[PDB]
Amino acid sequence: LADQIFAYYKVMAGSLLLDKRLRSECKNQGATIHLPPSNRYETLLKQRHVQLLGRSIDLNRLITQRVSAAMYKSLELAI
Amino acid sequence: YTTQSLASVAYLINTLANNVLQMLDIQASQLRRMESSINHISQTVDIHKEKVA
Amino acid sequence: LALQGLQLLSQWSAHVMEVYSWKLVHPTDKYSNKDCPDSAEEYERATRYNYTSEEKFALVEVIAMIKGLQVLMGRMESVFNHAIRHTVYAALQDFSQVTLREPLRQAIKKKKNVIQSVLQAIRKTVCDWETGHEPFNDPALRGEKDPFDIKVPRRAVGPSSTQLYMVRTMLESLIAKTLRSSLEGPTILDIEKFHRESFFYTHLINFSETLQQCCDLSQLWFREFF
Amino acid sequence: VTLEDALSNVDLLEELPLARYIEQATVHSSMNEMLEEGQEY
Amino acid sequence: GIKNELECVTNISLANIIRQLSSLSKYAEDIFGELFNEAHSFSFRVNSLQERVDRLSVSVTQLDPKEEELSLQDITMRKAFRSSTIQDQQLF
Amino acid sequence: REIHQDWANREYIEIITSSIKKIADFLNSFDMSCRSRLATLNEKLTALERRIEYIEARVTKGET
Ligand SMILES: [Cl-]
Ligand SMILES: [Cl-]
């Protein structure tokens, strides 16, 4: 879940900042840069107390732990 | 004894719940003041690092 | 609504478990599923390989619809408990105190002692008279028709299980020379009406336990037989 | 108004003139306890 | 069975209601205790942070831009700062 | 008679049991509400602890 959430928001960032004119030029050239499909991760990201086998699981906290590590790894790779 | 028991349990729960809520309200405002305090330290460090630069 | 929602939840749970149940006795093979090797053991052929992508999504949908509605029904328990108790009480008292007058009148007006004794036993068992006592000035209790009105009380409490068992069983014996042939047309339909409707009363009075039993998907994990 | 409803009205004309439950409930309740025991087995 | 006395059932079932209130008192205590223990655990962290925040304020006010020298030994002789990388697993 | 008193007795019983269920409901929804609040507090506190570690390291020398 954390893996795909990070990958989803990175692809979103990359798409948002991709020059629009280039996008359309590629489309006309028959090489459309395919826009990523939208997803519904927010409700999972808002879960602070998943009740499972008598435990109260903070899913948000756990996802953050991995997403933060992914952010740091992205930045290390860039440098 | 039933009526007395129902009244007692409701009371003791109401009292303890109210205290827990008060404890969480205090802890929230503690973090709010602490963030404000940390932020000012951070700004002060930023300013200092720029001055050296 | 309480009954409708329980029936709907039951339909959905039965759907999921029946699909699953069917799959367990019909495990797939290479001929029906190209991705399933002949080397795959029965249980994996019964579960894992026995569902397409579309089947797995559809199952999670229904499971979610069940569990989601279970939450909303549970949140409405207190309101439901009160309204069910009021409705069951009202139906039972209206039926016993008022609806049974006409067949009781006709039981004394004619010489039908057996039918009279059961109709009276029913009334004795459940009737919660507003005054505290049965009205003896009642014309139907004597044998003659009405020029008569009874105000039936409204309580938020159902009968006990013994009360309901006795009433239902005694009413049943009337509609089962049989005791049935010695009763009028509209009255027989009236007992049948109440006997049919009272079938679900125990379920509805025990709402919480019934809710869980309508949403039970616990058996999907267990595999001791395999 | 169905045909059997009309026939029943004619049947009415040919008709005109010219306790133990507590025990059964006790048997039933006893048999129910066996069901619960069987479930345990 | 069904042969029991009405008032006897009433009293027994009322006694069981008082038992339910007993278990509900125990259930309530457990709930409030689990919540207290977490908030209590936070208090130790909050206090320990507050003192760290206060002695940093002091250390920061005493920073002198005119005085501060830059050392290339911070690169070769001393480790790079690393933030906490602890992850929770095996939660059951 | 005794059945009329039984009806009153069971109505009383019904009222008490209803009230017990209301206490249980409150207890469960209070637990859930506080679980959220403790999660939020831990989230903010963890962040504030991390930020302090960072700021301190900006002002302090590393380990040899
Ligand atoms: Cl559980
Ligand atoms: Cl029955």
UniProtKB/Swiss-Prot annotation, chain B:
Q: Which body tissues produce this protein?
A: Widely expressed. Abundant in testes, ovary, thymus, and colon, with lower but detectable levels in prostate, peripheral blood leukocytes, and spleen.
Free-text description of this protein's post-translational modifications in UniProt: Phosphorylated by ABL1.
t-SNARE coiled-coil homology domain segment(s) = 1-53
* Disulfide cysteine pairs (residue numbers): none
Cell compartment(s), UniProt = Cytoplasm; Nucleus
Belongs to which family? Belongs to the ABI family.
Annotated function: Regulator of actin cytoskeleton dynamics underlying cell motility and adhesion. Functions as a component of the WAVE complex, which activates actin nucleating machinery Arp2/3 to drive lamellipodia formation. Acts as a regulator and substrate of nonreceptor tyrosine kinases ABL1 and ABL2 involved in processes linked to cell growth and differentiation. Positively regulates ABL1-mediated phosphorylation of ENAH, which is required for proper polymerization of nucleated actin filaments at the leading edge. Contributes to the regulation of actin assembly at the tips of neuron projections.
Disorder noted: There is evidence, including phenotypic data from ABI2-knockout mice, that loss-of-function variants in ABI2 may play a role in autosomal recessive intellectual disability.
Q: What is known of its domains?
A: The SH3 domain is critical for binding to ABL1 and ABL2.
What protein name does the entry list?
Abl interactor 2
Q: Which organism does this record belong to?
A: Homo sapiens (Human)
Curated annotation (Swiss-Prot), chain D:
Signal peptide bounds: none
Task: Give the subcellular location.
Answer: Cytoplasm; Cytoplasm, Perinuclear region; Cell projection, Lamellipodium; Cell projection, Ruffle
Q: What is the top-level taxon of the source organism?
A: Eukaryota
Its quaternary organisation is: Component of the WAVE1 complex composed of ABI2, CYFIP1 or CYFIP2, BRK1, NCKAP1 and WASF1/WAVE1. Within the complex, a heterodimer containing NCKAP1 and CYFIP1 interacts with a heterotrimer formed by WAVE1, ABI2 and BRK1. Component of the CYFIP1-EIF4E-FMR1 complex which is composed of CYFIP, EIF4E and FMR1. Interacts with FMR1 but does not bind to related proteins FXR1 or FXR2. Interaction with EIF4E stimulates FMR1 binding. Component of the WAVE2 complex composed of ABI1, CYFIP1/SRA1, NCKAP1/NAP1 (NCKAP1l/HEM1 in hematopoietic cells) and WASF2/WAVE2.
The family classification in the record reads: Belongs to the CYFIP family.
Mention any additional remark.
Breakpoint hotspot for the Prader-Willi/Angelman syndromes and may be implicated in autism. Commonly altered in tumors.
Q: What is this protein called?
A: Cytoplasmic FMR1-interacting protein 1
Residues included from the entire protein: 5 to 79 of 1253
Curated annotation (Swiss-Prot), chain E:
Family, similarity comment: Belongs to the SCAR/WAVE family.
Highest taxon of the source?
Eukaryota
Task: Give the protein name, as stated in the record.
Answer: Actin-binding protein WASF1
- Signal peptide feature range: none
Domains (record comment): Binds the Arp2/3 complex through the C-terminal region and actin through verprolin homology (VPH) domain.
What residues of the intact protein does this structure contain? 21 to 112 of 559
Which source organism?
A: Homo sapiens
Tell me which disease this protein is linked to: Neurodevelopmental disorder with absent language and variable seizures: A disorder characterized by neurodevelopmental abnormalities, including moderate to profound intellectual disability, with autistic features, seizures, severe impairments in speech, and gross motor delay.
Write the lineage as a comma-separated list: Eukaryota, Metazoa, Chordata, Craniata, Vertebrata
Free-text description of this protein's post-translational modifications in UniProt: Phosphorylated on tyrosine residues by ABL1 and dephosphorylated by PTPN12.
Job of this protein: Downstream effector molecule involved in the transmission of signals from tyrosine kinase receptors and small GTPases to the actin cytoskeleton. Promotes formation of actin filaments. Part of the WAVE complex that regulates lamellipodia formation. The WAVE complex regulates actin filament reorganization via its interaction with the Arp2/3 complex. As component of the WAVE1 complex, required for BDNF-NTRK2 endocytic trafficking and signaling from early endosomes. Also involved in the regulation of mitochondrial dynamics.
Localization: Cytoplasm, Cytoskeleton; Synapse; Cell junction, Focal adhesion
Question: Which cysteine residues pair off into disulfide bonds?
Answer: none
Gene name for this UniProt entry: WASF1
Swiss-Prot record, chain F:
Q: What is its main location?
A: cytoplasm
This protein's UniProt keywords: Acetylation, Coiled coil, Cytoplasm, Cytoskeleton
**Localization per Swiss-Prot or TrEMBL:** Cytoplasm, Cytoskeleton
Can you tell me where the transmembrane regions are?
Answer: none
One molecular function GO term is:
identical protein binding
Keyword Ion transport attached: no
Top-level taxon in the UniProt lineage? Eukaryota
The answer to whether keyword Coiled coil applies is: yes
Q: InterPro entries of this UniProt entry?
A: BRICK1 (IPR033378)
Q: What Gene3D superfamilies does this protein's entry cite?
A: 1.20.5.110
**Which GO cellular component terms, listed alphabetically, does the Swiss-Prot or TrEMBL entry include?**
cytoskeleton; cytosol; extracellular exosome; lamellipodium; SCAR complex
Output the GO biological process annotations, alphabetical, semicolon-separated: actin filament organization; cell motility; fibroblast proliferation; in utero embryonic development; positive regulation of Arp2/3 complex-mediated actin nucleation; positive regulation of fibroblast proliferation; positive regulation of lamellipodium assembly; positive regulation of protein-containing complex assembly
Q: Which residues form a coiled coil?
A: 32-63
Q: What interactions and quaternary structure are annotated?
A: Homotrimer when in free form. Directly interacts with WASF2. Component of the WAVE1 complex composed of ABI2, CYFIP1 or CYFIP2, BRK1, NCKAP1 and WASF1/WAVE1. Within the complex, a heterodimer containing NCKAP1 and CYFIP1 interacts with a heterotrimer formed by WAVE1, ABI2 and BRK1.
Role description: Involved in regulation of actin and microtubule organization. Part of a WAVE complex that activates the Arp2/3 complex. As component of the WAVE1 complex, required for BDNF-NTRK2 endocytic trafficking and signaling from early endosomes.
Give the family per the record.
Belongs to the BRK1 family.
* Name of protein: Protein BRICK1
Q: Which gene encodes it?
A: BRK1
